[PDB]
């Protein structure tokens, strides 16, 4: 195997004195011996406080050349780091430090996450990140010290996962596994080795996109990371010209933000070494992904991916953003819902997506065997996601197997709902949910909430709903008007918690 | 890790009714899950006939979509392929399959190569190839067999290579070694996953290129591979046109051939679809590199690689094809010629080039300790090759270590004079080599041949060196003519047998 450390090490053998990160906003520069030596250093010190190899390490930080360069330095050591979303709620940051045994956690957050996890009943040295390193200038003392043996199946970094139940299941990602979440950006979205490679760090560094596709992928094909520490659409354009960005990969909302933006300042910013433009599309309204392909330069690549098994499905220059392909490294299936892995559906029956659990899988939930084992299944993962098999022999992705509604026989997919009555004037946010009912089974209902100053009528809707697309069984079979909607820290939509909402 | 087998067992599932094998001369066309099922058959057929994994087997034969089929089932099975080049002398062939302890070999060359075997006292079960696999249409027996466990360290393939000493060492490539084989590819030379992949079969199955950086990456990336059996430089560029063929990797006499063609055979045939054109051009002349630039589509994408340790570097757009700068999986030194692997040049000096022995590398000679121990040493492979480090921070190969001369302090690479040598007016081939000498160390001198003919002399040779960018310590001393150069079955000059008949 390549580990994420030998895939970087390699690379600062090839290009020592080439641009490896990059905080343009800040003037911070530092090539890929700079960079290394950084990490060596922070590593070294680390364990000069007597941090071994294994030991796990919550890192709780916004994106940051200092927040790579501590990330890297915990995993040059030895130390396995947990990557934790900064906008979670200072409990629940708290609980899942407690609940995966960490020896330290890397905080750069306000005082309030240090003071909750202090008094936790933890027991995880609270490290402040600019203790350690601050503007790549590292603090360091003791000796260089050991490289650590590293095994194939041997936890490496783990990243956290928003499941149904409640608190962020930790997916255990080990060592063999970086190679391909790094590859699968030259094999699917066209990256290649080279010190042209300039590339946007618009994903932050708790996602494993942000982490593997972006961060180490920029660094291990020796090219140059350049680090954003907040997004706004202009600023992110003018990096594009200013740094001379080869690729970005970014969500739905950026690109909404940022396209839109590429029309406001039009030919004003040159965009043509922008090659490669990627995402995560299966949630993107096909309204977003016309104006994508209008209003932005390079290569539009479609990519369907989990935390769990990094990239299962893709497509080349979309047309909708719901159907994709298996690429390089990955075997795909869909079975009857709540069936066996080998009950393949008849090819136009709705199933759920599972593909295959080799190199790039993760080896289960930290102190989770019961979740573990109803997605680690006789050597396929479950992705929870409803598909198809579509006429041009690919995959069209439906919505998720917790959202899905069934409305006497008929399955029925909220999120396709919701992008109808997204477009119907008025309307700025829409959830739909299936309530309980002895009749129809499942009753279909849209949770809408009116533009500033708007009133929304469910007559009007349904009207709007009358006129659309949507087979008659799929229309709502009731409207809640709401002033918004229940949602978590970051930054989602309960549907557990509406539904109650919705009754008493 | 990702196996050969288990990379186009993956690609058969993503895309079974993709073209995977094409003959179109022979109007053969095999789809990705008929080749499987076809591989699949051939390997129960060989294990219904006692054949065991692990074991070793041979394969001589052309290029041909029966040896493809023959090779792949073999290892689907679970034995080890050998394959070794059909050129090679019949008693070679012979000694080969008895120094490896073979137990069958599969053959599809003249009698006299299967009467050398058989009489050799070998124990080696001869396999005609028409036997196993005739037209793509299998002969077979039993039921379905089963698919062995893999461990990243066991013999996969074997595959030859042509020391210095004198029969060709079996160099045995590991199953981890697969994935960066192939991948390469991708990193340095820019394919993509996709069934856009139309790649033309012009390298020999027996040469490492011609079977994962071509054969495999074809079907890997679930494109198609294009069979060629015999090499013709404008039959080439018709399959070009006719197949939408999208790279090509070749040597630098077909790519002199090609190009030579494609002036010939003008705007008649259409090569756009042509993106890559790839080969090994350290031993390129700039003339041919040049017409390559002038007179072929495409990305030119120079490679170096060894047998060994698959590649090791590379350069987009080339100017020259000495230059070239380590790519993707690589890690390379240049160190002092004869001495430890940690002793790196001043920078500026000659030395060996090395490079780190990681997935990609070979795991030893069969039965040669002692060559592997003069091959890997302390993570490192020894290329044999001389190397420097250029101004612009790029590695300039100059020649073979065995094949340096050293007359009075100054190193001296016979490959640059030939070069310079083979320009002059009349020259039809030359090979300079060093003579024994004891004032000057060793004497210069250059063995030519005259085109058809012509008559030349050394006084004017002499004359022309003088007038060429030769330094003057360079210049041969002494100038042999002859009517041919000895050079063995496949198809190189005897730089051993030349010096000795150069003396009496
Ligand atoms: O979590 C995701 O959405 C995700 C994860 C991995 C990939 Cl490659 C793409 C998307
Ligand atoms: O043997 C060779 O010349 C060779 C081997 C491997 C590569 Cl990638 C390139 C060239």
Not at 123 to 140: N, T, W
Not at 245 to 274: E, I, R
Not at 420 to 446: C, F, K, M, N, Y
Request: proline share 6%.
């Amino acid at each position: 195997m390549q580990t994420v450390n030998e895939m970087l090490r390699r690379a600062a053998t090839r290009a020592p004195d080439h641009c490896a990160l990059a905080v343009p906003a800040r003037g911070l520069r530092l090539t890929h011996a700079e960079l290394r030596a950084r990490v060596e250093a922070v590593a070294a010190r680390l364990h000069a406080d007597g941090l071994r190899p294994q030991q796990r390490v919550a890192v709780v930080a916004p994106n940051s050349a200092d927040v790579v360069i501590a990330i890297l330095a915990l995993h040059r050591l030895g130390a396995v780091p947990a990557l934790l979303n900064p906008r979670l709620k200072s409990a629940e940051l708290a609980e899942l430090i407690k609940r995966g045994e960490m020896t330290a956690a890397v905080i750069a957050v306000g005082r309030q996450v240090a003071d909750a996890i202090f008094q936790s009943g933890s027991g995880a040295r609270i490290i402040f990140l600019g203790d350690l390193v601050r503007d790549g200038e590292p603090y360091s003392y003791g000796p260089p010290i050991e490289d650590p043996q590293r095994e194939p199946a041997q936890p490496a970094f783990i990243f956290y996962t928003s499941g149904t139940t409640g608190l962020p299941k930790a997916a255990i990602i080990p060592q063999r596994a970086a190679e391909s979440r790094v590859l699968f950006m030259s094999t699917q979205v066209g990256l290649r080795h080279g010190r042209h490679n300039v590339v946007l760090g618009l994903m932050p560094l708790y996602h494993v996109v942000g982490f593997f596709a972006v961060l180490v992928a920029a660094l291990a094909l020796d090219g140059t990371y350049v680090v954003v520490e907040e997004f706004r659409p202009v600023d992110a354009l003018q990096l594009v010209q200013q740094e001379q960005v080869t690729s970005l990969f970014a969500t739905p909302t950026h690109l909404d933000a940022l396209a839109a933006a590429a029309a406001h300042a039009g030919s004003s910013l040159k965009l043509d070494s922008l090659r490669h433009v990627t995402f995560a599309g299966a949630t993107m309204p096909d309204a977003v992904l016309e104006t994508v392909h209008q209003h932005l330069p390079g290569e539009k690549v479609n990519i369907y991916g989990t935390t769990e098994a990094m990239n299962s499905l893709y497509m080349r220059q979309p047309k909708t953003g719901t159907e994709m392909a298996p690429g390089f490294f990955s075997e795909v299936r869909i079975v009857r819902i709540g069936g066996g892995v080998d009950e393949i559906v008849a090819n136009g029956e709705e199933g759920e997506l599972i593909v295959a659990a080799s190199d790039s899988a993760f080896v289960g939930y930290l102190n989770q065997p019961q979740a573990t084992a109803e997605k680690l299944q006789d050597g396929w993962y479950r992705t929870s996601d409803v598909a198809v098999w579509t006429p041009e022999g690919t995959v069209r992705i439906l919505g998720r197997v917790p959202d899905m509604i069934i409305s006497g026989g008929e399955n029925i997919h909220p999120s396709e709902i919701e992008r109808v009555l997204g477009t119907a004037p008025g309307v700025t946010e829409v959830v739909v949910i299936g309530l309980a009912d002895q009749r129809w089974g499942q009753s279909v209902t849209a949770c809408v909430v009116p533009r500033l100053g708007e009133t929304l009528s469910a007559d009007a809707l349904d009207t709007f709903c009358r006129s659309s697309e949507l087979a008659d069984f799929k229309r709502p079979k009731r409207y809640f008007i709401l002033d918004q909607l229940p949602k978590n820290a970051l930054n989602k939509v309960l549907r557990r918690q509406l539904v109650q909402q919705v009754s008493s």
